Amino acid sequence: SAVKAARYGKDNVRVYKVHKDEKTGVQTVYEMTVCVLLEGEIETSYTKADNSVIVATDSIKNTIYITAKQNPVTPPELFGSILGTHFIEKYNHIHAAHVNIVCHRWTRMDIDGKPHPHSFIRDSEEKRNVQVDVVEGKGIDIKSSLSGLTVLKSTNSQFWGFLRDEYTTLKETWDRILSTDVDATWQWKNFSGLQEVRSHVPKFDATWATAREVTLKTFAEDNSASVQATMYKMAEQILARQQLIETVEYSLPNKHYFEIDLSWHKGLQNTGKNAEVFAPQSDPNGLIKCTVGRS
Amino acid sequence: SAVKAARYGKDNVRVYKVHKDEKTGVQTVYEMTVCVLLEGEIETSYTKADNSVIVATDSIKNTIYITAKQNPVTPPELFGSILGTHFIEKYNHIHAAHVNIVCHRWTRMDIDGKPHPHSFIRDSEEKRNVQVDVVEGKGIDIKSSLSGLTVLKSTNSQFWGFLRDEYTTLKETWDRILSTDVDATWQWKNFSGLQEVRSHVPKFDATWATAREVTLKTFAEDNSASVQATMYKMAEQILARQQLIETVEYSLPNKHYFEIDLSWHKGLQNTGKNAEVFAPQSDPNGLIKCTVGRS
Amino acid sequence: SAVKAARYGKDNVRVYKVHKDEKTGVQTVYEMTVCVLLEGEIETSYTKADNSVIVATDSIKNTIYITAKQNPVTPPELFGSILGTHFIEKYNHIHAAHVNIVCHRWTRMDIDGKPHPHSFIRDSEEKRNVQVDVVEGKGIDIKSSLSGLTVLKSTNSQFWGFLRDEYTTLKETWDRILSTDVDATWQWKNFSGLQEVRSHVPKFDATWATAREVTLKTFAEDNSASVQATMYKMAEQILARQQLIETVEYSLPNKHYFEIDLSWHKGLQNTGKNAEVFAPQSDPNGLIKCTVGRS
Amino acid sequence: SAVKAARYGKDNVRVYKVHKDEKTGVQTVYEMTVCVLLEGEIETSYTKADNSVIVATDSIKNTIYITAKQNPVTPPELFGSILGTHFIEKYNHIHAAHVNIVCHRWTRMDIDGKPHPHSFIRDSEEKRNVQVDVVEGKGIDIKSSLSGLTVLKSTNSQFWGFLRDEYTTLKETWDRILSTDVDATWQWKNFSGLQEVRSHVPKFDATWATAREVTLKTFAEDNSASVQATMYKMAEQILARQQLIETVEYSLPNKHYFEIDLSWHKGLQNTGKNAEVFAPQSDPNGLIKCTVGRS
Ligand SMILES: O=c1[nH]c(=O)c2nn[nH]c2[nH]1
Ligand SMILES: O=c1[nH]c(=O)c2nn[nH]c2[nH]1
Ligand SMILES: O=c1[nH]c(=O)c2nn[nH]c2[nH]1
Ligand SMILES: O=c1[nH]c(=O)c2nn[nH]c2[nH]1
Ligand SMILES: [Kr]
Ligand SMILES: [Kr]
Ligand SMILES: [Kr]
Ligand SMILES: [Kr]
Ligand SMILES: [Kr]
Ligand SMILES: [Kr]
Ligand SMILES: [Kr]
Ligand SMILES: [Kr]
Ligand code: NA
Ligand code: NA
Ligand code: NA
Ligand code: NA
């Protein structure tokens, strides 16, 4: 046999960091979950019980904490790039570092209409994520995303004109509920190394803000022909707004809300124009995916 | 043997309702998960295979949908009271209905600074709940709550002066992180029936808003001596603000954030005044509970 | 205001223990999750920032580990009794200790038909639990349970003869699927203290084994008239087999499996006697509860 | 912009099927969760609101049920191949079908030492899965796996000889706990179509049984130098036992169990040879991955 691929490291590393402005008293918090997996000249750890090539996962954990103490943890694209660059530079035999970061929301509280200096709320389970692949001699590949952004519109969604054959029961509709959990990813141009990442730092927060704003506005305003058509509009607008993005990917469940025919009970009218009460369906769910790039 | 207690019904009934103002075009959505369990002269269904006393759980489900079509679903205290009253009035042999409702957030989106007429975001996993126990001849007992309200403050929490003996390792602290998931319950005066509930309807939304506001402000502003001391302040203020509440209950995890001593690595200082990077602990967690009533 | 009830402590304490027979080489493992909440003369911690009455939750955690090192962790009824007795004896002002234990399965592997001395499998997510309430001057109240025991029978379940009115759509059936997650609790006679618990130690494992055996056999063999009727048979048999049990409680979801009418497609027959393919329903679910005691 | 990749379909389709031997009375059950995502000449559904190219996800759901009624659902590799072949054959413009199946355990109960004809237990949360990619003109690519197989050994695991530098705190050990959740995947030789899959049908159940047996025996018997070394032994043995497998992949968390130093309390000895009570760590966790192929 032989090792065809191998990577290893530490997953599920929870990290908090606080910044304290000792002049204003304003504190700012950051919380993430980090995974770092390494690749390199490590096959003998698998084939010959050769632990000498292993940077222990415990040491990778220590390194995450140390790196967070010594550097900014925001934007996550930068932190992940710093962290991944450390492992390929420090260890000659390590040739790739794959850094995944999930950023958790801690939004400053407003108390009596004033932002509080040191109190925060988890205002959504929505995450901001990065995948940063630092590959020796091949630069830094970053995928940024938002996920867990759960939305619903109560009208201005349609679905008609689809293929109809002997497997089809679905009725056409000109007015339905549309709800999803948005998972949106933007793939950056390859960066040559950490200097190039640092040169673009403001673009990371700005492009996440653009992606989120476009997602929400297009969802709210598009009189949707399908999930497919609406998500494509989101992607095209994000590409138009940031030239350093190569592709935008969406992965969207269609979280169905079924009408409930109540006409069997006292002639109650609860379908079509009279539909008020619906049954949210936990499963199954449509799942619609697109990757959009330039033409 | 004999049946000492019995209740049965339908759990996990997902319900959506929309309101459409056909004059303004503004739509408003409501989503909940409902459980209804009944009690009464039902023991023979258990002891003698006598299904004649069973209102089928499927029929209880149907009834939840029908009741949502025929009545307001807000405030949940009212909906639950309507629903529970239906079962004890409709069925002579049913003597109690226990209605639990979890309300899911669908907050109207603001698009370009204007509230959108029909688009919503799940802006938090925080729930608003009710437990409505409708007991024939004994009125309606309501417990209202908020849950899943996750908060953190980065300073202005202390914990010193606790008992120290041979089981104690914990260091006293005058400056720590405090984070919790708030579960706060207010117990209403017994209501004699549905008329009395309806007579107090505006108090339900107002008291939930008070409970939430007091929770957030007291958490943010109290230089906390302990979870115990802070939560008591919340409860006392809520009781002072609504005379129709008899008790307030809090159940709070202390979601610990541990300092990380990095002095083994290059003398890095990350404890005490220099603490910036922390390890959030998933488990174990302190769990602190109080029920507060009038003196 | 005043404190009407209060309890506090440490939840979600994960504990492993190994026993090593250094003569045979056979190792045996135990894994649990423990919660200990204390009550007593603690109100001033809530009302006056008086931490002197607080046995820190961190110290409660330490105590759980220490107690596991110094005593058997099995049966859980005994461990919980030891642990709870410690807090009310050690601390004059602590008057109750509420100990919850969830026991996780680690079943010894059989390798080439021989039990392995030190390798284990999590052979089910089924738990064995205890709730041990140690109350100074009032002894030790134990509730034992099994939970998460998920079963299905493909026939020999019926449901007919239930109440039919204008809310009813459910068809009677003489042959359906029945599936549930068993939560079964047996409540012991009050014990006067730890000596009395210890005097009954073999009964704990024997009664858990009886409860499990009766559950499985009655589920498998009863041509069920309803969940209600079948669960009552389980409870009555357990009471008949252990006189030191006062009550048995079951809480059972009816995890519905719906027929799928396929007659719209090529006349396919998939209902009634021809039903082969079903749609498991995630929600809603019936929920049926009984507490059975002696007559 | 332009569509670079697109796939869509129905996820989370729960399916049960029963087989009834009407001669012996023995019933056998199967339960799965299915996802089917299609690719093909579908870009205009995204770019031009052209729903004519969409086989509705609802219709894909119907098709899963119909296919389960008309064909065996076991082995899952065969069912998935049938299902995926249907979509690329039925629809000229659909060129790939990606079928994921998770198989849930329903193990026949033994009652009084005899297998019961129609009662089953979910004896583990362990899954058997397939990923079947049916690509028009490119055959059928199958990845089979087992997942959620949770194991622990209490000794005969070591970890020493790893890289030690200024980031390292981990102590070498010659005797530790090892616990993981096994995710093991075997990748089949490409099949030309459904006939070739059918020609190998017995190999699917046999190779899953081999993979599971080798996993358990190697875990139990290897005096492990590392997760890396042990998992490689598993993979090499599986490749040696089935020539129609090209690669074996393992993904293994190292679910850490930490010693607890209790020497601060009464000199209690709970480390090294005296270690009995451990703290299972929920997070972080090592994560170790290998893909092994022939040399
Ligand atoms: O927007 C939708 N897209 C689809 O592909 C689909 N299929 N059924 N319903 C659907 N809704
Ligand atoms: O606020 C707190 N309350 C307690 O009871 C406690 N125990 N350890 N830490 C604690 N923090
Ligand atoms: O066993 C059952 N019990 C019930 O109470 C019920 N109601 N609907 N179906 C049911 N099945
Ligand atoms: O088996 C192990 N492999 C590793 O790579 C490792 N790192 N820390 N501990 C470890 N244990
Ligand atoms: Kr962080
Ligand atoms: Kr969308
Ligand atoms: Kr609702
Ligand atoms: Kr608090
Ligand atoms: Kr244990
Ligand atoms: Kr049952
Ligand atoms: Kr199935
Ligand atoms: Kr392993
Ligand atoms: Na390198
Ligand atoms: Na009644
Ligand atoms: Na005491
Ligand atoms: Na085709």
Catalytic residue among D17, D57, D143, D233: D57
Cβ of C16 closer than 6 Å to ligand 9, yes or no, is: yes
Please identify every residue of C annotated as catalytic.
10, 57, 256
How far apart are alpha carbons D258 and D121 in whole angstroms?
Answer: 33
How far apart are alpha carbons A47 and A51 in whole angstroms?
Answer: 10
Q: Which two tokens stand for residue D212?
A: 């599971």
Q: Is A154 strand, coil or helix?
A: coil
Q: What is the DSSP string of chain C?
A: -EEEEEEEEEEEEEEEEEEE-TTT--EEEEEEEEEEEEEES-HHHHHS--GGG-B-HHHHHHHHHHHHHHS---SHHHHHHHHHHHHHHH-TTEEEEEEEEEEEP-EEEEETTEEEEEEEE---S-EEEEEEEEETTTEEEEEEEEEEEEEEESSSB-B-S-B-STT--PPPBSS--EEEEEEEEEEEPPBSSHHHHHHTHHHHHHHHHHHHHHHHHHHHH--BS-HHHHHHHHHHHHHHH-TTEEEEEEEEEE--EEE---TTTTT---SGGG--EEEE--S-EEEEEEEEE--
Residues of chain C with Cβ-Cβ distance to A283 below 8 Å are 282
Residues of chain A with Cβ-Cβ distance to D14 below 8 Å are 283-284
Task: Identify any residues that bridge with C37 across adjacent strands, giving them in sequence order.
Answer: C9, C98
Name the closest residue on chain D to residue A93, using Cα atoms: D163
Domain range enclosing A234 = 1-295
Q: Is D207 a catalytic residue?
A: no
Q: Which residues contact B126 (CB under 8 A, 6 or more apart)?
A: B105, B146, B147, B148, B149, B150
Establish if C116 touches chain D: CB-CB under 8 angstroms: yes
Name the closest residue on chain B to residue A66, using Cα atoms: B262
Catalytic residue among D95, D98, D153, D256: D256
How far apart are alpha carbons A269 and A275 in whole angstroms?
Answer: 7
- Tell if the CB–CB gap between B111 and A69 is shorter than 8 Å: no
A128–chain C nearest CA distance, Å:
28
- Which DSSP symbol is given to D25? -
Q: Looking at the partner chain, which of C11, C46, C254 has a beta carbon nearest the beta carbon of B228? A: C46
Which ligand lies nearest to the CA atom of residue C215 in the structure?
A: 10
How do beta strands A27-40 and A114-121 pair? unpaired
B57 is in an annotated binding site: yes
Q: Which of A10, A13, A57, A61 to mutate to test the pocket of ligand 4 (most atoms within 8 A of CB)?
A: A57
Cβ of B73 closer than 6 Å to ligand 7, yes or no, is: yes
Q: Of A295, C58, D235, whose CA–CA distance to B281 is shortest?
A: C58
Q: Which chains touch A (3 or more CB pairs under 8 A)?
A: B, C, D
Please say whether the beta carbons of D218 and D236 come within 8 A.
no
Please say whether the beta carbons of B85 and B94 come within 8 A.
no
Amino acid making up residue B74: T
Please say whether the beta carbons of A86 and A110 come within 8 A.
no
User: Measured in whole angstroms, how far is the alpha carbon of residue C115 from the centre of its chain?
Assistant: 27
How far apart are alpha carbons C98 and C143 in whole angstroms?
Answer: 11
Q: Which residues contact C286 (CB under 8 A, 6 or more apart)?
A: B8, B9, B10, B11, B57, B58, C227, C253, C254, C256
* C242 CA → ligand 9 middle, Å: 26
Number of other residues whose CB lies within 10 A of the CB of residue C166: 11
Closest residue CA from atom 1 of ligand 12:
D227
D108 is in an annotated binding site: no
Which ligand lies nearest to the CA atom of residue B152 in the structure?
A: 8
- Which DSSP symbol is given to A276? -
Count of residues making up chain C: 295
Q: Looking at the partner chain, which of B119, B149, B155 has a beta carbon nearest the beta carbon of A118? A: B155
Q: Which two tokens stand for residue C145?
A: 């349970």
User: Measured in whole angstroms, how far is the alpha carbon of residue B270 from the centre of its chain?
Assistant: 38
Alpha helices in chain A (DSSP H): 43-47, 57-70, 76-90, 194-199, 201-221, 227-241
How far apart are alpha carbons A7 and A43 in whole angstroms?
Answer: 10
Q: Which residue of A11, A15, A16 is the best one to mutate when testing the B interface, meaning the one whose CB has the most B CBs within 10 A? A: A16
Residues of chain A with Cβ-Cβ distance to B111 below 8 Å are 216-217, 220-221
* Cα maximum dimension of chain B: 78
- Report the sign of the C-alpha dihedral through residues D106, D107, D110, D114, in that order: positive
Extended strands (E) in B189-241: none
State the CATH number of the domain containing residue B166: 3.10.270.10
Task: Identify any residues that bridge with C8 across adjacent strands, giving them in sequence order.
Answer: B288, C38
Q: Is A57 a catalytic residue?
A: yes
Q: Which residue of C90, C92, C162 is the best one to mutate when testing the B interface, meaning the one whose CB has the most B CBs within 10 A? A: C162
In total, how many domains does chain D have? 1
Cβ of B58 closer than 6 Å to ligand 3, yes or no, is: yes
H/E stretch holding D150 reads: strand D139-153
Q: Of B280, B216, B227, whose CA–CA distance to B251 is shortest?
A: B227
C91–chain D nearest CA distance, Å:
17
Name the closest residue on chain C to residue D258, using Cα atoms: C16
| Residues 245-284, chain D, touching C (beta carbon < 8 A) | 257, 260, 262, 265, 268, 270, 275-282
- Tell if the CB–CB gap between B169 and D266 is shorter than 8 Å: no
Q: Which residue of D167, D283, D285 is the best one to mutate when testing the B interface, meaning the one whose CB has the most B CBs within 10 A? A: D283
Q: Which two tokens stand for residue D222?
A: 């290897």
Q: Of D34, B139, B287, B86, whose CA–CA distance to C166 is shortest?
A: B86
Q: Looking at the partner chain, which of D15, D27, D270 has a beta carbon nearest the beta carbon of C277? A: D15
Which ligand lies nearest to the CA atom of residue B254 in the structure?
A: 2
Number of other residues whose CB lies within 10 A of the CB of residue C271: 13
How far apart are alpha carbons A47 and A1 in whole angstroms?
Answer: 9
Phi/psi-derived region of residue A156, left when phi > 0, alpha when psi is between -120 and 50, beta in every other case: left
Inter-CA distances, C276 with D15, D27, D29, D77, Å:
10, 11, 10, 20
- Tell if the CB–CB gap between D166 and B266 is shorter than 8 Å: yes
User: Measured in whole angstroms, how far is the alpha carbon of residue A218 from the centre of its chain?
Assistant: 18
Indicate which technique resolved this structure.
X-ray
D272–chain A nearest CA distance, Å:
19
Residue B117: cis peptide before it, omega within 30 degrees of 0 = no
Buried b (16+ CB within 10 A) or exposed e, C82-118: bbbbbbbeebeebbbbbbbbbbbbbebbebeeeebbb
Which ligand lies nearest to the CA atom of residue A101 in the structure?
A: 5
Q: Looking at the partner chain, which of C16, C257, C268 has a beta carbon nearest the beta carbon of D69? A: C268
Amino acid making up residue B164: R
Q: Which residues contact B23 (CB under 8 A, 6 or more apart)?
A: none
How far apart are alpha carbons A227 and A236 in whole angstroms?
Answer: 14
| Residues 141-170, chain A, touching C (beta carbon < 8 A) | 166-167, 169
* Cα maximum dimension of chain A: 78
Name the closest residue on chain D to residue A64, using Cα atoms: D167
Establish if C203 touches chain B: CB-CB under 8 angstroms: no
Phi/psi-derived region of residue D161, left when phi > 0, alpha when psi is between -120 and 50, beta in every other case: left
